[PDB]
Design a protein around this ligand. Structure first.
Ligand SMILES: [Hg+2]
Ligand SMILES: [Hg+2]
Ligand SMILES: [Hg+2]
Ligand SMILES: [Hg+2]
Lengths: 251, 251
DNA sequence: CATGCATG
DNA sequence: CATGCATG
């Protein structure tokens, strides 16, 4: 029902998202910042073999594109549940220390979770899949996140960079959080009887009745889907009395 | 007033302490543990004079003593929150690795400190100065903590070691606590109507009335003096309404 | 692999 | 100075 009625709301049924109302982001640098190119430490063909499918997908999705940049940061093969299942992790620390910092306005629901009265006991918890990737990166700021990739029997060979906000970038959480707040501001005003808490990509909708959480939830999915975002159907806690939000269990 | 009546209770009035009822401690090693001597790190001689005043003090107190041992750990010049001067900080990690570990036995969980009945609001907070140094090291375990220190004036040039529980040794906190529990047990039984909390070298005495706290505090100080322990009068919170204990501030 | 931050 | 833990 939830999936079938809102295919564009889930990653499982609508594919990767793209925030339709968010203009490409330009990344301001610190005044004295100049390009830094960190050589890629040779990777075992194994680690490279595991990472190939992920790069290939990103490349197929257009999230990654070839490029030539005076900037370059190392790609690290991270090990997690899965033998030859290496995960591509970029070390953007040298880029991060050269990028201008931003100062949020985030009430921080993590603490503002206390701003959820017992008056609202019906919940719906959603987490957006690949949130950061929904925000586009302006072509002028794309060269900043380049890394090297060489694969003979694949096609390309040299540098690739991101066309979307990257994981590992210090301002991604804050930039995504601001964008989502701007996009859901209307939803809030239109649903004054609902309580919506949002922390980066983690959403919690609370209402005073079962019917309200139901209709409110249907309305949230519609909005997210129309906006281009994608919720994870597998981790979704739809219309529950007891839920897990930000590591905190709610009764 | 609390000094002249209990000169042996305070460090400022009774000098360094020595736990009279605590036999010299033997330090169990791990089965395969063999001697490890990590050459003295490379450190400026301009700091070789800043530590002398501290090494000279300990040697005069009998806390440090000459010795030749197959064991050896580096000594590194580190600053301290107190007076602006460089003190000796031994890196015992390699020794800590080869030493048998020990497991606690006293109720520490926060649900214990807060377990303090609001009925006892007249407190007394004390912290024992150089607590670890109150416990002696059996000579068969002294060679384990040896470190080098060369200087003509000192008389000879070779190795020094401790004859007291050393700082930076993994088990000192636990060993001292156990020792103090055994030494104060008698006191706890003699004053059942008093609440005595102790965490390493941090004590809290709480009674129901102001007079009982005054009697209980006098009694505690006299007991610690007889036992050889020394309280820091500089930071002693003698029989107050508002006191800070282990961080928290309670009334 | 490389580093930042804490700790002996 | 060294190094153990976390993290990009
Ligand atoms: Hg996306
Ligand atoms: Hg580029
Ligand atoms: Hg002492
Ligand atoms: Hg010795």
């Amino acid at each position: 029902t939830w999936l079938s009625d809102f295919p564009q709301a889930w990653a499982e049924t609508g594919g990767m998202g793209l925030a339709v109302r968010q203009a490409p982001l330009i990344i301001p640098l610190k005044a004295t910042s100049t390009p830094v190119s960190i050589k890629q430490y040779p990777m075992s063909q194994e680690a490279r073999l595991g990472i190939k499918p992920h790069i290939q997908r990103l490349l197929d999705q257009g999230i990654l594109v070839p490029c030539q940049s005076p900037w370059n940061t190392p790609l690290l093969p991270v090990k997690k549940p899965g033998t030859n299942d290496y995960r591509p992790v970029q070390d953007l620390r040298e880029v991060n220390k050269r990028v201008e910092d931003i100062h949020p306005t985030v009430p921080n629901p993590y603490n503002l979770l206390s701003g959820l009265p017992p008056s609202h006991q019906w919940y719906t918890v959603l987490d957006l899949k690949d949130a950061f990737f929904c925000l586009r990166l302006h072509p002028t700021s794309q060269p900043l996140f380049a890394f090297e990739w060489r694969d003979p029997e694949m096609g390309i060979s040299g540098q690739l960079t991101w066309t979307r906000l990257p994981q590992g970038f210090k301002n991604s959480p804050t930039l995504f959080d601001e964008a989502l707040h701007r996009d859901l501001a209307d939803f809030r005003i239109q649903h004054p009887d609902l309580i919506l808490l949002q922390y980066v990509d983690d959403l919690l909708l609370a209402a005073t009745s079962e019917l309200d959480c139901q209709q409110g939830t249907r309305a949230l999915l519609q909005t997210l889907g129309n906006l281009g975002y994608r919720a994870s159907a597998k981790k979704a806690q739809i219309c529950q009395k007891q839920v897990k939000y930000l590591g905190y269990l709610l009764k």
